[PDB]
């Protein structure tokens, strides 16, 4: 039994998003489903469970009004979206199914013991912008992708011919909500002139890839 | 209606890690565990003889996860949950980063690159400070320039482990193009278990 979330969402405030939870496995109407969600490097948190049977839902304390948790119970799928997001909304959100079965008649809650993969939500006020690439001179060398979103930037070098000494670096976000990170390959002293390095840096979200050339 | 959980241990391997969850009345209620490996998302914990390293363990007021012959793969976070039938609320923990403290220390290895020519014909200016293969995850990084520090403009990463399993970091230090070239050099002075590397660079 593995439960399958939709893919990584990324909205700007005002824009919903919906993040659907697809059970395979088991009798649909089994169990219950949670919806527990973690913040940017922070705990767990719950917001609810939705029975797919009954279709009821129980909403948690400070997640009720703007979440609403649907059901499908033919394509035997659960979701969770959020009409109306905010800037503090971005979070990675996570599905659950209650399939443990209660070791003591006392206490009968089922416990979570199927997880989703987590659709990363990422939800702030900025536009799409395209990363320009500068060449960082020198041993080491080095590229400059600054002042971009939404992450992604998939940087290697020479169309995949160096492996050995790359290490792409994470982005720095910065105050203007544009990201920004460096790639860096330290090359043999002896081998600059006798060898053509070039950054591979391509952004999908921005339809932006540039291979642009580090020369002294 | 809480739970309560310490915020960080560190346990050598092969050793006993002891997390706590702390309720009341809970002395009823099982609660259950959680382990998040970073990334991936958390898995539920699931308890001579058949050995056992993790042994769920409940006692009226604090539930205590007892983790035996700590290994390399338990190094994650771990949660406690229950459901506060008084409530109607399924209560998280806050979670406790269980580090292990097996690698030894490394000196950070720091690359710092001057603004490059084609950022100052747009005018602007963004120096780079590197720092790689650092353990364990201090780096107080300071920007000194023309022997004065400067704060202004200075951002720096949150340290993140890598694939080698040592934490590497980066910092950025935005600075207007007149600045740049006014000044006679600048410095990434990071600092590290109380050992500081410095780099230097120039306007040529």
């Known amino acids: 039994v593995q439960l399958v979330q939709s893919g990584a969402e990324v909205r700007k405030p005002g824009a919903s998003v919906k993040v659907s939870c697809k059970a395979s496995?088991?009798?649909?109407?089994?169990?219950?489903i949670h919806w527990v969600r973690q913040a940017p490097g922070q705990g767990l948190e719950w917001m609810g469970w939705?029975?797919?049977?009954?279709?009821?839902?129980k909403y948690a304390q400070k997640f009720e009004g703007w979440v609403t948790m649907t059901r499908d119970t033919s394509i035997s799928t659960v979701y969770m979206e959020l009409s109306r997001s905010r800037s503090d909304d971005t979070a990675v959100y996570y599905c659950?199914?209650?399939?443990?079965?209660?070791?003591?008649?006392?206490?009968?809650?089922?416990?979570?013991?199927?997880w989703g993969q987590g659709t990363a939500v990422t939800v702030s006020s900025a536009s799409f912008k395209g990363p320009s690439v500068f060449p960082l001179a020198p041993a080491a060398l080095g590229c400059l992708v600054k002042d971009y979103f939404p992450e992604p930037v998939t940087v290697s070098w020479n169309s995949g011919a160096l492996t050995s000494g790359v290490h792409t670096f994470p982005a720095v976000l910065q105050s203007s909500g544009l990201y920004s990170l460096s790639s860096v390959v330290t090359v043999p002293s002896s081998s600059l002139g006798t060898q053509t390095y070039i950054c591979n840096v391509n952004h999908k979200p921005s339809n932006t890839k540039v291979d642009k050339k580090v020369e002294p | 209606s809480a739970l309560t959980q310490p915020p960080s241990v560190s346990v050598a391997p092969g050793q006993t890690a002891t997390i706590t969850c702390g309720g009341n009345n809970i002395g009823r209620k099982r609660v259950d565990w959680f382990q998040q490996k970073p990334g991936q998302a958390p898995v539920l914990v699931v308890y001579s003889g058949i050995p056992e390293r993790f042994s769920d363990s409940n006692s009226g007021t604090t539930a205590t996860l007892t983790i035996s012959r700590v290994e390399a793969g338990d190094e994650a976070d771990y949660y406690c949950?229950?459901?506060?039938?008084?409530?109607?609320?399924?209560?998280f923990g806050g979670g406790t980063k269980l580090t292990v403290l097996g690698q030894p220390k490394a000196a950070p290895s720091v690359t710092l690159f001057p603004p490059s020519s084609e950022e100052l014909q747009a005018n602007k200016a963004t120096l780079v400070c590197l720092i790689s293969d650092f353990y364990p995850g201090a780096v107080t990084v300071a920007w000194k320039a023309d022997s004065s520090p400067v704060k202004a403009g200075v951002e720096t990463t949150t340290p993140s482990k890598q694939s080698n399993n040592k934490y590497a970091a980066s910092s950025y230090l935005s600075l207007t193009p007149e600045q740049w070239k006014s000044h006679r050099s600048y410095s990434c002075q990071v600092t590290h278990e109380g050992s500081t590397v410095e780099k230097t660079v120039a306007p040529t």
């Open positions: 496995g088991y009798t649909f109407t089994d169990n219950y």
């Open positions: 949950q229950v459901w506060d039938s008084d409530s109607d609320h399924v209560v």
């Open positions: 939705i029975h797919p049977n009954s279709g009821a839902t």
């Open positions: 659950a199914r209650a399939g443990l079965h209660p070791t003591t008649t006392e206490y009968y809650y089922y416990g979570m013991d199927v």
